[PDB]
Here is the input.
Amino acid sequence: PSLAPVLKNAMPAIVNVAVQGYKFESIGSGVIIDPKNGIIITNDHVIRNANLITVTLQDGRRLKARLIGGDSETDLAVLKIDAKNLKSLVIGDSDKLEVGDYVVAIGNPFGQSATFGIVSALNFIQTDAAINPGNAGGALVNAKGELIGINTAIVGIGFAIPINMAKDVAQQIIKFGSIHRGLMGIFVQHLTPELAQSMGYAEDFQGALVSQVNQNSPAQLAGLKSGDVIVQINDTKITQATQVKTTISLLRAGSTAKIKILRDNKPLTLDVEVTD
Amino acid sequence: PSLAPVLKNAMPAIVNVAVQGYKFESIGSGVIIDPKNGIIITNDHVIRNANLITVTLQDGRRLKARLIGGDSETDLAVLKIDAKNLKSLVIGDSDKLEVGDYVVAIGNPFGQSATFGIVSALNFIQTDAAINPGNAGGALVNAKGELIGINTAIVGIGFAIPINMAKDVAQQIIKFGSIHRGLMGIFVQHLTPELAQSMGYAEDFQGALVSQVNQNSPAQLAGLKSGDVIVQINDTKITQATQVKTTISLLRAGSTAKIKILRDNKPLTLDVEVTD
Amino acid sequence: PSLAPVLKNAMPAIVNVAVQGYKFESIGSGVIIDPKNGIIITNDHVIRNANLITVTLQDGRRLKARLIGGDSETDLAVLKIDAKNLKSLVIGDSDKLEVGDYVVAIGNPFGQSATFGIVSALNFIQTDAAINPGNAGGALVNAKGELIGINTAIVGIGFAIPINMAKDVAQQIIKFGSIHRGLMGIFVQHLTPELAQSMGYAEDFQGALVSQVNQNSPAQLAGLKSGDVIVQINDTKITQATQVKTTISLLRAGSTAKIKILRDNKPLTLDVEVTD
Here is the structure.
């Protein structure tokens, strides 16, 4: 057997990414996620100080890109392409992923490049498939050609970000133009006036909107649902998203934190367990 | 396909090993061999100058260990655990091993870590599976999850000790509290007074007991069986096990060596061919 | 499964190659191509400044070798052995090769050594199978044990020369005692007097014989067939094979080049597109 059949299918979605800033020359790969919107994902540090981000496809179509946004902590960034006809790959679930699963790291450093290995450990994915500068921000796929992760930069040891997590950050960037991680597996956003009155609240109302609560995280289990609004963490008032990361990070691990929330006009309070 | 099914089964037997001496901090992995006795094997240099050897299991049970003994030349050491409920892995035969066989190097450097490759050459096993400090003394297993070797430290090139050989040294350590390799594939031991009269000899009788003769080695083929007793190698008398390695090492390769033995009360003499 | 069955079959054809010159000591591997003629191939730089090239087989038969010739650009060289009984391997087609295909790099650095990986990219073959000094000039084989390439020296990244190309250069060396690469995928040779009158031409006739035109190359598509004879490239006369590489290299990429040829007594002219 071989992987050629299934890599043939993965290939088209993998792009090359050249960056020029200040003169600067950066090169990495990227994966097309939504061809009907022209959306691709690559590493965050590749497009750092980016002045000219140029994407080259498989068919050689050189195109210019628009950084919708990027995330530091996962080293991920999202770009938009204003083009059509694009093809993507079949994408899988990183939840089904187990150590021992075979794995291939693809990229496009020039004008392909695939390395084989397995998953070594399992919030990134460790692998003995050889990742490179040329193929960071590229596609890590399973033995079925399903996209299970995005390559990053760091030995004999590679790391990728599980595509579930990857897609979660891209969406926040797509829907909000940004991404802000608060406490214990939740994502928060600035509760703008227009967002406030989109949720039945007053224009003058302030807080940190919870844009997503990851399942079985301490906050989900502390009872915090998405669409809630934090106004106070302990004896400190909250009025923007960045304050959550700030307030939380200034409290020792495993501490009881009383956080006032506001779910559908009713104020609550949630006792929560701080995680490092 | 994948290896997850079979690595799931291997995992429980793999331990983490933390060592403190003189302040010193050493970390490696190890494999549980006999759960009904609490016996684990790891690398010898990990527990060097060991003052505190602490073992952490899969279920997180941190336990203290007792160095039964260790071997330098194979870089192997044996530890005892005074605990119950333990599970081991399925263990194979290193004789069935051939170059080309797939292979996975597992360890437990933190709190898993598995790398894939094949057997490169075949008295250790060379492999392109990536071994590390974190995963030396850990389990090398075949494509069937059978334990075929123990990882060691040294590139793109790893080495393991064939589990047959590994089990042979552990047993000597278990049965005798030590291990001494004499000439051409044989293992010798101090013929203590209590051992002498356990074999029908006199209390006052002296020699180097042969505790094991490996099959098809020059000494087996020179006719030397286990349970024999060397009293003289050439014109030099023998009275303890260490003298065999000493006497033999001082003779050029492929030399004729006349060794008086004593098998069941009858003295013999064996013409033997020195191997480097 | 495993690869042992199929590596067993490959092994015999793989040789060790030790070189002594000026004191010099070089070591690499090589593959037996034609056992009925005693022909082996290895890397070119291994037998550089070679004064004593000694080959050792699998059965340990140490034999002396005769450098028929070698090629720099592909880093390949051909040696002859004046011996019998030899066995070779099953050899494949590098055209069927695709990225994702599994792959094993074998050699004989001592007295075997095989590493596993896939084809990474595709005029050499890139692979994440680990090549070494010890195993350069050795056999890269597919998952079927078919010889698909010859290992070379250069990271996490190996390179081999597709066996089709490899066999093409060896034959030129075998048939002509040399190899000279002209323009855009063609091979040229000195049109010696004896060769001239072997092709119906006069003894006094001069030019650069085309000893092979690779399919779908610019020159094939420019209409140039093997067995033709170049006498002029542009306004410059041609009288030996080395002049083609010389003339061509002194013209910018993608230029129109008018080359007088002489196919079966009739002069032509061929408009050709220069490739870098």
